[PDB]
Design a binder for this molecule. Structure first.
Ligand code: CLA
Ligand code: CLA
Ligand code: CLA
Ligand SMILES: CC(C)=CCC/C(C)=C/CC/C(C)=C/CC/C(C)=C/CC/C(C)=C/CC/C(C)=C/CC/C(C)=C/CC/C(C)=C/CC/C(C)=C/CC1=CC(=O)C(C)=C(C)C1=O
Ligand SMILES: CCCCCCCCCCCCCCCCCC(=O)OC[C@H](CO[C@@H]1O[C@H](CO)[C@H](O)[C@H](O)[C@H]1O)OC(=O)CCCCCCCCCCCCCCCCC
Ligand SMILES: CCCCCCCCCCCCCCCC(=O)OC[C@H](CO[C@@H]1O[C@H](CS(=O)(=O)O)[C@@H](O)[C@H](O)[C@H]1O)OC(=O)CCCCCCCCCCCCCCC
Ligand SMILES: CCCCCCCCCCCCCCCC(=O)OC[C@H](COP(=O)(O)OC[C@@H](O)CO)OC(=O)CCCCCCCCCCCCCCC
Ligand SMILES: CCCCCCCCCCCCCCCC(=O)OC[C@H](COP(=O)(O)OC[C@@H](O)CO)OC(=O)CCCCCCCCCCCCCCC
Ligand code: HEC
Ligand SMILES: CC1=C(/C=C/C(C)=C/C=C/C(C)=C/C=C/C=C(C)/C=C/C=C(C)/C=C/C2=C(C)CCCC2(C)C)C(C)(C)CCC1
Ligand SMILES: CC1=C(/C=C/C(C)=C/C=C/C(C)=C/C=C/C=C(C)/C=C/C=C(C)/C=C/C2=C(C)CCCC2(C)C)C(C)(C)CCC1
Ligand SMILES: CC1=C(/C=C/C(C)=C/C=C/C(C)=C/C=C/C=C(C)/C=C/C=C(C)/C=C/C2=C(C)CCCC2(C)C)C(C)(C)CCC1
Ligand SMILES: [Fe+2]
Lengths: 170, 244, 30, 97, 137, 56, 32, 168, 33
């Protein structure tokens, strides 16, 4: 929450790449596990299918061929190469955490993606121009002022009631 | 017939003023030694017209029609005030209270939205002199106040306002404040409107009357940030008069 | 010009989708 | 040419005392005996010219005119400021705790 | 810091007569305040009328005064507006209105004084937070 | 510097869904064959043509 | 909107250069 | 170091105006947040001059005093904050004046507290402003430290801090 | 100089688009033989 209100971290493309790689990693995690479990070959005779696998078998325990058709027809495209598939699973989340890191190196220096100048020049001149970007900066300003005195006590911030940004009523 | 909330809810009728039979063209006599009141005044706009800005060359700007976008939320109702009897015989309505404002947004061709505070706050409306009865040729003409559309606590999208808010463009910490003054500094406008009320139906029995109205007032100036438009509102009205 | 630029990139991606689906390398069983 | 009317008011007696023509009704809580009964009468009858017109409010009691006397040192009048009194802001100005 | 009897010493009446509370009483008066009052007065505010808090400076300038235990017990018996001019047991819980405010039906006179002591002790502990609202959370 | 506008106007397209018209009158309803509807038609046309081309 | 007009050339080359690179490698692959 | 040189000058009997007038602009300019490298943005591009503008001159040290003549000190902007309120304290750090957000219950406004600004050194040396709107704007620049005149026209500066080559 | 801003993108593209086209055809020619 510090990082939202002081750095506007959600707006930083390096974090956005990171979000994509973590949520895409989880997607790859789930969709690959679910695909394997639902393209298994029948290699035993019970309803617990976990026993039909010998780690020394030569054979693929599921059907790449049927998996590929399923996903080509459901989603338009599919993996066909098992090696690229598990390499891509490494790449996606590993690449996303790296992008996020770069953005934090930026923030070590307060080198933030905090503003869009073009929005602020319009906003400052046109009191009817409002976007989700300006609404979020107003939140950010709330976080800074309401949380700083106690969050950075060594600063001896004293904010009289009357300076504390607040909307109506609240 | 006496209707019920459950009869009306969701139909658009709650935004309609009462009406009077085509056959109510009587007259309500005014006992000059008697005090009178409006128990209910209801105004229901039907059209909103906005003066187009006559460009530099100008010649003569017209009032162009507009499209309402804020739905069946436009009517003034439950407005009350005493109906004085003047010494020259005229009648004068003095609003005390009521639901006497509705913010309304209409849209002009091209897509400009014109917000306005449709209102008759502090209305004082008078008849021609020497009126011994209200009839279907009785007119009242009045003026009213139009407060600023937003009130002092309203914060613009960068957090600036009159009675609250930032006092500068905090996003542009070292801009020259001088070009931003008009938006940085909030101003609260109070201006005057005019309304004609033309009685056309009277039920001398119950003291109900109905007619059309036209008013003229300014639209929102967004607390001084821009120039308002002249607006002309037309519609219909209903009023019940009781002895006071 | 900025609006046009965002819409152009978006349109290129939708065209890419088309070719990626309908003109993919067909997977074959070798 | 362009000034915040409310900030300018803080430079007046409004900024030190209870402006009988302008201040929100909750400020009368500041002094004993005024809230809510007299505060309501002062406001309802508000627009005053001199603080002392407040003792002429029709219907005061003798106790009420006394309470008002002890607290005239706390009252001021300044010109009515439209931005403070519109919107019923004298009764509720959007400030709570 | 600790809950000392000097903290637990509050004005009994407006005569300046004081009384000294125990830990047992103060804590009782917190439980009872939480049961019968915090719904509206959590932390010394008043949700249904924020203009009136339970700060001792506010209670003092009440008519009659309420920065003491007897004044508070009386208010919990028969409450009034802040200027004392109207009774308000119709809308404010009170022994007088125990029929419509059931939570008051089983409050002993000692249960009331405990709540009074809690109310009067809490701002010596919490200072500005009490009756200050969310600024001070 | 309007270049296709006038060819729409030449053949009877004169109003915008926004309520204006090139002859300056305000508060019109041009129906579907507004400037916008005409631009939309040609884009839908372009798309249907694109698919036809793939098929052929 | 008072955008940076260097942003247009920046965006344009950001796309064109690397995309050109890929296209060149792919076509020369399809012809051998 | 600025304060040191000044306190010295007032020991050799020189006047306020004289001790402050002796501070080199170059040292003043360093005591300014706009040259702090941690005040920029990743896509705020180009020279620092494109933000706050091309520094033209020291305006002079701004000295704030309330109606009682006591000297007040603008609380300075820390680097973390893109924006920051204007609070003035006495020598001991008691809040004494501010620019309030909600005005209704304000008790430290400049108008109420009668605060003035007087300048010592640089361009406004000897000038004193009493009208609150003016005092407020110099108060808002004082959060950045020493106040300078800027050419914003030449590079069409946007007023938003950029970072320095040390940052990049 | 007060020069048309789009001159830059126009020169860039005027240069890049036809050149890239040529290169594409050249490199894929060489990969045949
Ligand atoms: C309908 C649900 C929905 C959708 C479509 C998206 C889509 C997006 N979000 Mg959001 N997100 C959601 C719900 C959703 N989100 C919710 C509920 C939350 C919490 C409130 C968040 C919190 C969140 C954060 C914190 C961030 C995003 C980000 C993103 C982007 C990357 C997402 C990604 O890689 O995911 C993993 C999934 C994939 C890799 C599969 C591909 C999905 C594609 C990229 C989605 C594209 C949809 C887009 C609108 C295009 C539609 C075109 C079509 C109409 C022709 C993307 C534009 C990031 C962002 O804003 O980047 C710009 C970012 O930083 N999201
Ligand atoms: C859609 C929601 C969403 C998603 C998916 C993410 C995803 C991410 N965020 Mg974002 N975040 C979001 C919303 C979201 N965020 C919002 C709304 C905000 C407010 C601005 C933030 C604020 C935020 C901050 C402030 C930061 C992130 C960071 C990150 C990354 C964390 C990487 C990680 O695994 O760290 C976990 C840590 C590690 C992987 C490193 C060490 C791990 C070792 C191996 C641990 C070993 C444990 C060991 C066995 C001991 C066990 C003991 C046990 C008992 C506890 C990742 C890209 C971080 C980032 O960008 O990092 C660069 C970061 O600092 N985010
Ligand atoms: C060590 C490298 C370095 C450093 C520190 C600087 C620093 C500086 N240069 Mg210089 N410059 C450099 C290299 C460098 N330059 C090079 C190599 C060139 C030739 C292109 C130039 C050309 C140049 C010019 C023409 C100008 C500068 C100027 C400046 C100043 C402004 C910089 C600015 O606004 O950044 C802006 C920086 C960014 C917006 C950051 C870009 C980062 C984006 C996000 C790209 C990275 C995303 C990437 C694709 C992610 C992919 C992920 C993938 C792996 C999955 C500053 C002092 C300016 C100045 O004031 O000169 C007088 C100026 O006009 N420089
Ligand atoms: C009109 C307008 C303008 C448009 C609307 C605008 C709109 C909002 C769009 C803007 C969106 C925009 C800005 C996008 C932001 C995206 C952004 C943040 C990008 C991140 C960029 C990036 C490089 C980050 C680095 C991290 C990174 C590499 C993430 C990659 C994540 C990713 C693509 C994961 C894959 C997701 C996914 C859908 C996989 C499908 C896999 C699939 C086909 C599995 C099926 C399958 C499974 C099996 O198991 C087997 C066996 C087989 C056979 C098989 O097939
Ligand atoms: C190579 C072929 C072409 C490549 C594609 C070209 C686009 C590349 C991306 C361009 C960068 C985007 C810059 C924004 C556009 C713009 O306006 O900038 C414009 C700015 C210059 O800024 C201009 O300056 C002018 C004064 O001369 C005026 O002030 C203008 O207003 C201002 O726009 O460009 C740069 O400053 C040059 C870039 C140098 C950046 C190096 C420092 C960053 C090093 C970090 C690298 C880490 C990467 C990690 C990734 C993993
Ligand atoms: C300014 C607009 C810019 C927008 C466009 C953005 C481009 C997005 C990326 C598209 C990249 C193309 C991938 C190439 C791979 C492939 O296509 O192989 C060759 C394909 C695949 O089929 C193949 O057919 C081949 C045999 S044959 O020659 O067809 O007989 C055979 O080799 C192969 O096995 C079979 O699959 O077959 C063709 O011959 C098509 C070639 C033309 C494709 C490129 C044109 C892209 C421009 C489209 C613009 C759309 C705008 C329309 C507006 C109305
Ligand atoms: C309350 C939290 C949820 C509790 C139930 C957990 C649900 C399991 C998660 C499934 C989501 C993943 C979809 C792929 C899941 C996938 O296809 O899995 C299939 C996997 C094995 O399938 P089998 O067909 O071998 O067994 C399931 C039945 O057939 C019983 O033999 O199912 C489980 O192991 C069942 C465990 C349930 C134990 C409870
Ligand atoms: C009709 C029902 C709804 C379905 C409509 C879906 C249409 C969209 C799906 C097509 C995506 C095109 C794939 C191109 C690229 C392509 O053709 O890939 C095809 C590729 C085939 O993999 P193989 O295993 O064949 O690869 C062997 C190769 O590695 C040879 O080196 O599949 C991927 O690598 C799987 C991962 C896809 C990762 C991207 C999927 C998600 C992309 C979505 C991003 C959206 C951004 C939106 C921005 C606004
Ligand atoms: C629990 C038993 C309690 C106690 C001890 C008190 N309250 Fe309330 N309270 C409420 C309201 C609306 C008011 C204001 C009424 C008015 O004056 O118009 C009050 C006032 C008080 C006071 C006076 C404080 C002062 O500054 O004068 C005191 C001491 C007090 N109360 C004690 C509202 C509520 C509730 C909402 C339903 C509930 C529940 C309570 N109060 C409960 C209690
Ligand atoms: C001219 C001009 C211009 C420009 C333009 C442009 C630049 C364009 C571009 C264009 C583009 C860039 C486009 C593209 C397009 C695309 C396409 C055409 C698409 C396609 C797609 C498809 C068809 C799809 C399909 C499908 C299906 C069927 C199913 C599901 C999936 C999918 C979706 C894939 C301007 C404005 C300046 C001005 C005026 C003139
Ligand atoms: C440069 C130049 C030139 C040339 C130019 C050109 C040639 C241009 C063109 C351009 C173009 C040529 C453009 C076009 C565009 C197009 C478009 C943009 C399209 C779109 C489409 C779409 C979007 C579609 C869609 C769809 C589909 C696909 C399917 C279904 C349906 C639909 C419709 C939806 C000249 C010589 C003059 C000179 C100057 C310079
Ligand atoms: C009469 C009329 C009109 C006109 C119309 C027209 C002009 C039409 C057109 C139309 C057209 C223009 C159509 C087209 C269509 C097309 C199609 C229908 C297509 C299809 C395609 C497909 C189906 C394909 C497939 C594929 C793909 C996509 C890829 C892969 C391969 C294949 C080949 C399989 C109007 C409007 C005036 C109105 C009035 C009346
Ligand atoms: Fe696997």
């Amino acid at each position: 929450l510090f990082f939202q209100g002081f750095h506007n971290w959600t707006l930083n493309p390096f974090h956005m790449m990171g979000v994509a790689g973590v949520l895409g990693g989880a997607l790859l995690c789930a969709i690959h596990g679910a695909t394997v479990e639902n393209t298994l070959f029948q290699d035993g005779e019970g309803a617990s299918t976990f026993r039909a696998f010998n780690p020394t078998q030569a054979e693929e325990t599921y059907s790449m061929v049927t998996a590929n058709r399923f996903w080509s027809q459901i989603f338009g495209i599919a993996f066909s190469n098992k090696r690229w598939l598990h390499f891509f699973m490494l790449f996606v989340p590993v690449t996303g955490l790296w992008m996020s890191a770069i953005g934090v190196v930026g923030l070590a220096l307060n080198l933030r993606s905090y503003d869009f100048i073009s929005q602020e020049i319009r906003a400052a001149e046109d009191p009817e121009f409002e976007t989700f970007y300006t609404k979020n900066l107003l939140l950010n300003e709330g976080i800074r002022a309401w949380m700083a005195p106690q969050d950075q006590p060594h600063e001896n911030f004293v904010f009289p009631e009357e300076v504390l940004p607040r909307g109506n009523a609240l | 017939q006496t209707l019920t909330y459950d009869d009306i809810v969701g139909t658009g009728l709650a935004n309609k003023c009462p009406t009077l039979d085509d056959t109510a063209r009587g007259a309500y006599p005014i006992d000059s030694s008697q005090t009178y009141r409006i128990a209910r005044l209801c105004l229901q706009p039907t059209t909103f017209l906005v003066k187009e800005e006559p460009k530099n060359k100008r010649q003569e700007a017209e009032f162009v029609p507009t499209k309402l976008v804020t739905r069946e939320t436009t009517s003034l109702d439950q407005i009350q005030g005493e109906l004085k009897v003047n010494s020259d015989g005229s009648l004068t309505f003095v609003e005390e209270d009521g639901i006497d404002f509705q913010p309304v947004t209409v849209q002009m061709a091209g897509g400009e939205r014109i917000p306005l505070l449709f209102t008759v706050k502090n209305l004082v409306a008078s008849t021609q002199p020497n009126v011994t009865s209200i009839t279907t040729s009785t007119d009242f003409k009045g003026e009213f106040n139009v407060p600023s559309y937003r009130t002092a606590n309203f914060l613009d999208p960068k957090g600036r306002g009159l009675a609250s808010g930032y006092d500068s463009a905090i996003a542009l910490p070292q801009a020259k404040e001088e070009e931003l003054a008009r938006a940085n500094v909030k101003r609260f406008s109070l201006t005057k409107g005019q309304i004609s009320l033309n009685v056309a139906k009277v039920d001398g029995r119950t003291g109900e009357i109905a007619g059309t109205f036209e008013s003229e007032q300014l639209s929102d100036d967004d607390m001084g940030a821009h120039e308002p438009h002249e607006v002309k509102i037309q519609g219909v009205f209903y009023a019940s008069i009781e002895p006071a | 010009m900025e609006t046009i630029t965002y819409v152009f990139i978006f349109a290129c991606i939708i065209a890419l989708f088309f070719f990626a689906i309908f003109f993919r390398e067909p997977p074959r069983i070798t | 040419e362009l000034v915040n009317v409310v900030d300018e008011k803080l430079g007046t007696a409004y900024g030190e005392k209870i402006d009988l023509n302008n201040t929100n009704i909750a400020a009368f809580i500041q002094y004993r005996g005024l809230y809510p009964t007299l505060a309501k009468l002062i406001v309802k009858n508000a627009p005053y010219e001199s603080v002392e017109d407040v003792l002429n409010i029709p219907g005061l009691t003798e106790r009420q005119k006394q309470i008002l006397r002890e607290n005239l040192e706390h009252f001021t009048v300044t010109e009515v400021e439209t931005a403070l009194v519109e919107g019923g802001d004298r009764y509720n100005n959007g400030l709570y705790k | 810091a600790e809950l000392t009897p000097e903290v637990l010493t509050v004005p009994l009446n407006s005569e300046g007569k004081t009384i000294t509370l125990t830990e047992k009483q103060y804590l009782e008066g917190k439980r009872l305040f939480q049961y019968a009052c915090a719904s509206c007065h959590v932390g010394g505010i008043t949700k249904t009328n924020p203009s009136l808090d339970l700060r001792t400076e506010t209670l003092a300038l009440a008519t009659p005064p309420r920065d003491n235990i007897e004044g508070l017990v009386d208010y919990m018996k028969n409450p009034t507006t802040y200027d004392g001019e109207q009774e308000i047991a119709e809308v404010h819980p009170s022994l007088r209105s125990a029929d419509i405010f059931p939570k008051m039906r089983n409050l002993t006179e000692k249960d009331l004084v405990a709540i009074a002591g809690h109310i009067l002790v809490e701002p010596k502990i919490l200072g500005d937070k009490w009756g200050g609202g969310k600024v001070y959370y | 510097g309007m270049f296709v506008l006038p060819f729409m106007a030449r053949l009877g397209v004169t109003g915008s869904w926004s309520g204006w018209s090139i002859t300056g009158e305000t508060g019109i309803d041009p129906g579907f064959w507004s400037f916008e509807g005409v631009a939309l038609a040609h884009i839908v046309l372009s798309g249907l043509l694109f698919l036809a081309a793939c098929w052929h | 909107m008072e955008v940076n007009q260097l942003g247009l050339i920046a965006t344009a080359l950001f796309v064109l250069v690397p995309s050109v690179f890929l296209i060149i490698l792919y076509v020369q692959t399809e012809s051998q | 170091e600025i304060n040191r040189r000044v306190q010295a000058s007032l020991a050799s009997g020189a006047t306020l105006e004289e001790a402050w007038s002796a501070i080199p602009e170059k040292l003043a300019f360093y005591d300014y947040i706009g040259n702090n490298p941690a005040k920029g943005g990743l896509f705020r591009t180009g020279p620092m001059n494109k933000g706050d503008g091309i520094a033209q001159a020291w305006k002079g040290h701004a000295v704030f005093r309330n109606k009682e003549g006591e000297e007040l000190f603008v609380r300075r902007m820390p680097a973390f904050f893109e924006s920051f309120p204007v609070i003035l304290t006495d020598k001991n750090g008691v809040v004494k004046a501010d620019i309030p957000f909600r005005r209704a219950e304000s008790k430290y406004s400049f108008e109420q507290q009668g605060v003035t600004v007087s300048f010592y050194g640089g361009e406004l040396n000897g000038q004193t402003f009493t009208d609150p709107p003016t005092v407020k704007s110099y108060a808002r620049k004082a959060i950045f430290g020493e106040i300078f005149e800027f050419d914003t026209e030449t590079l069409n500066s946007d007023g938003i801090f950029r970072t320095s080559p040390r940052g990049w």
